[PDB]
Structure formats: structure tokens, C-alpha cells
Design a protein around this ligand. Structure first.
Ligand SMILES: O=P(O)(O)OC[C@H](O)CO
Length: 411
């Protein structure tokens, strides 16, 4: 058998599902063996795959988070564009089948998808319904309601009211799209490499300052980057938790309480109605430099991932959105949204209203490094070391240096 190495960043429950998908494909035919290899968080996984390319130890497939897309698109010669791979191997590829938001987010300026969609998400407001009920609180729709609900929870003895993971993705990137404000110039990077950051504005700053002020009295508690704060929610310590829809699998298995999810809170001091939320998660890039049989097996595995049944199973088990309309329709016909209330929140929120350039998503080179900058500066806010105005100004300044570095090399 010819092995197809797939380096990915799926840990915990979702990682076990990756291994089930690969092995199911391996059991259906006798020519190709997909070998999934966990390489760490998204940054570690992308870094590892790129570093391996010199020693020719790089995988056939690498999962690269949405953040890394501009960098991967500029890495011409390192990637095998998926449409060319599929045609070369004799496998179908129909980009139009993917959700419109996925297509608009990932397509090149000429309308081509270079990578294979797989795990797309958006942030939702997770909540402990048991704790809300005991506190006499309601599911919030606005930021004022988030604070009031947090107060009721803590008054009723909850350790803390609200927290969030992936804080830049949630409280800067998605917060901006949800309120139709720009994240950077040149249409959040889609219109040019000469972009600069625009999130250092009064709307974002005032919200971050408001959250920091909730630390007193434990209405808010910071619980770290990425998914580090997950056990705060599943242990029943915080009653509200904003993070990826893709925590559904972990939450369903680890939470001893009744849980729900709803759309992100609206900051009514910024807007009277929400816009839409934006993509998170990753896509699958095929790397150059391998042989024909390795690519044939890669293409056949991508076909296995393209089926509505596999896409629906992945969505149902993880909380990543159904990546195609067909997978959504299959899940609906199976009664999944009736039997599991709220699992259609993420797909609805991505397409809530006709998008604007501010709500398409983001495309910034070196955004892997900018993500660290933004997390560092937000941590300075939670620690009381900087105001949000100063922290965001520093994040935009440091981020702009990274954008200029990318622009200089992308020519
Ligand atoms: O937890 P995920 O896979 O939905 O990813 C969250 C963010 O989009 C990562 O940048």
C-alpha cells in the first residue's frame, strides 16, 4: 500500500474523529493508507509542515487554519492546487457545492479553490442552561444582557459569569464582522497586500474595556488562549462561554449539565442589528514534491471527504458546520437539528445577512504572527497593565510591521 500522510491539528474528541475517518477510508479499499499525524495546535502544525519541506519529510496533506491562508496562497511552488490534483487523478471537484461563505472566504481572486474545505466553524455563545435556570437568568442576545446574566450567575454562587476562547478570533475578528466594522484596509486584506489594520478603534476598545471591568466580582475570568478555557465551561465554572461551534463534540461528552448555544451577543452601543459572523477552522492543503501514486491516494481520500454523508457525520460529531449545502440538507432530513437543538446556529450565523467587505472574512499575510501579537495585547488588558485603547494601538502597530514584511516578500 501507498501511504498518504495527513498532518493535522485536531486534538481531543475531534482528533479521535479524524482517526475514525482515515481508518474508514482505509477499510474501503486496499491500495492507499491514510496516516493521520497530530502535530500540535494549528500554529505548530503549519510550522511543522513548512519546516519539513526542505528535508523532503513533509506530508501529502496538511491542515492549515484559516489564519494561514494568505501565507499558503503566496507559497507557490510548495502546494499542489486541489483542482489540478483532482483533475490529474480523475476525481471530481465542484467548488460550487461548498457553502457560499466558504467559497468566498477561500477562493483566489480568480475564483479557484487551492485547498480542500473540511472543518469550517464560527464562534457561538455556549451556555449552561441548568445554571441560568437556577440563577433566574435568561439566554442573552445583547452585551448588556451578557453582563446582567453574568451578575445573576455569580450572585447565585457560580465561580464566574462569562469567558471566551480564541479571543482574537472571537472578540476582535468576529466582533468586527458581527458589527460591520473593518478589521483592516483593502477589504480586510482581500483587495491588496498594501493593507493595514483598523481594529484599533473605539468600538472594539470600549467592549474590551467593558469586559476587563467585569473581572472585578468575577463576572468575567480570562482562561487562556485557544481552547485552554474549555474546562472552565464543561466543569460548570463559567455559565457563558464564547468559542468555536466545533467544541460541540467535547461539550456534549464532558458537560454534566444541560447546555445550549446561541448567536453571538450584539453590542447595542455599536449597532442596532448584527451583520454576520465569519469563518474559523481550517482547510486541507496538498503539498508539492511527491509521486503520482501518493497524489492518486491523496485525491481518492479527498473524494471520500467530499461525500455528503462524511461531511454530515463530521459536522454532527464535532460542531464544524456542514461544509456543503448537501451535507446540511442531509443532516436536516435525518432530524439532526430537531434532535439536537441549536446545532444549526453556526451555519445560520455565517449567512445571517448579505455580506459586506467587512463581513467576508480576513486575508492577511503573516497573520499567524499577528494572532500572537493580538493575544499578547489582550492579555495586557485582562491583567490591568494596559487600557484597551493602548493595547489595540500597540497590536495594530506591531501587526502592521508584520503586514509590511509580508508585502516586501510577496513580490
Ligand atoms: O476551533 P476551530 O477549529 O473552529 O478554530 C478556531 C479559529 O478559527 C482558529 O484560528
Amino acid at each position: 500500500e501507498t501511504e498518504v500522510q495527513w498532518w493535522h491539528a485536531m486534538g481531543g474528541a475531534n482528533g479521535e474523529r479524524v482517526n475514525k475517518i482515515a481508518e474508514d477510508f482505509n477499510a474501503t479499499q486496499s491500495e492507499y493508507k491514510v496516516v493521520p499525524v497530530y502535530k500540535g495546535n494549528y500554529t505548530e502544525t503549519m510550522t511543522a509542515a513548512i519546516a519539513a519541506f526542505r528535508a523532503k519529510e513533509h506530508p501529502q496533506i496538511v491542515q492549515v487554519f484559516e489564519v494561514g491562508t494568505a501565507t499558503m496562497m503566496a507559497a507557490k511552488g510548495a502546494i499542489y492546487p486541489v483542482e489540478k490534483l483532482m483533475n490529474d487523478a480523475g476525481e471530481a471537484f465542484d467548488g460550487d457545492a461548498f457553502l457560499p461563505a466558504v467559497v468566498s472566504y477561500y477562493e483566489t481572486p480568480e475564483g479557484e479553490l487551492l485547498s480542500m474545505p473540511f472543518n469550517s466553524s464560527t464562534p457561538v455563545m455556549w451556555y449552561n442552561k441548568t445554571a441560568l435556570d437556577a440563577a433566574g437568568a435568561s439566554v442573552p442576545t445583547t452585551w448588556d444582557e451578557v453582563k446582567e446574566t453574568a451578575q445573576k450567575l455569580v450572585d447565585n454562587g457560580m465561580d464566574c459569569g462569562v469567558s471566551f476562547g480564541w479571543q482574537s478570533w472571537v472578540m476582535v475578528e468576529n466582533f468586527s464582522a458581527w458589527h460591520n466594522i473593518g478589521m483592516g484596509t483593502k477589504e480586510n486584506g482581500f483587495a491588496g497586500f498594501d493593507t493595514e489594520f483598523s481594529f484599533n478603534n473605539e468600538a472594539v476598545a470600549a467592549r474590551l474595556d467593558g469586559i476587563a471591568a467585569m473581572s472585578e466580582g468575577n463576572l468575567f475570568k480570562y482562561g487562556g488562549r485557544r481552547g485552554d478555557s474549555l474546562p472552565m465551561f464543561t466543569n460548570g465554572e463559567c455559565g457563558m462561554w464564547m468559542n468555536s461551534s466545533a467544541y460541540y463534540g467535547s461539550i456534549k461528552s464532558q458537560a454534566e449539565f444541560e447546555f445550549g448555544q446561541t448567536m453571538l451577543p450584539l453590542d447595542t452601543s455599536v449597532a442596532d442589528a448584527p451583520q454576520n459572523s465569519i469563518i474559523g477552522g481550517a482547510t486541507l492543503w496538498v503539498l508539492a514534491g511527491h509521486d503520482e501514486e501518493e497524489y492518486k491516494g491523496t485525491a481518492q481520500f479527498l473524494t471520500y471527504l467530499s461525500s455528503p454523508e462524511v461531511q454530515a457525520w463530521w459536522h454532527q460529531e464535532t460542531g464544524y458546520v456542514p461544509i456543503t449545502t448537501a451535507a446540511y440538507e442531509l443532516s436536516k432530513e435525518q432530524g439532526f437539528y430537531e434532535s439536537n437543538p441549536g446545532t444549526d446556529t453556526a451555519i445560520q450565523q455565517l449567512s445571517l445577512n448579505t455580506p459586506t467587505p467587512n463581513s467576508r472574512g480576513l486575508r492577511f499575510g503573516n497573520f499567524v504572527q499577528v494572532r500572537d501579537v493580538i493575544n499578547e495585547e489582550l492579555e495586557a488588558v485582562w491583567a490591568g497593565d494596559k487600557s484597551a485603547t493602548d493595547a489595540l494601538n500597540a497590536a495594530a502597530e506591531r501587526g502592521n510591521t508584520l503586514l509590511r514584511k509580508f508585502e516586501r516578500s510577496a513580490k
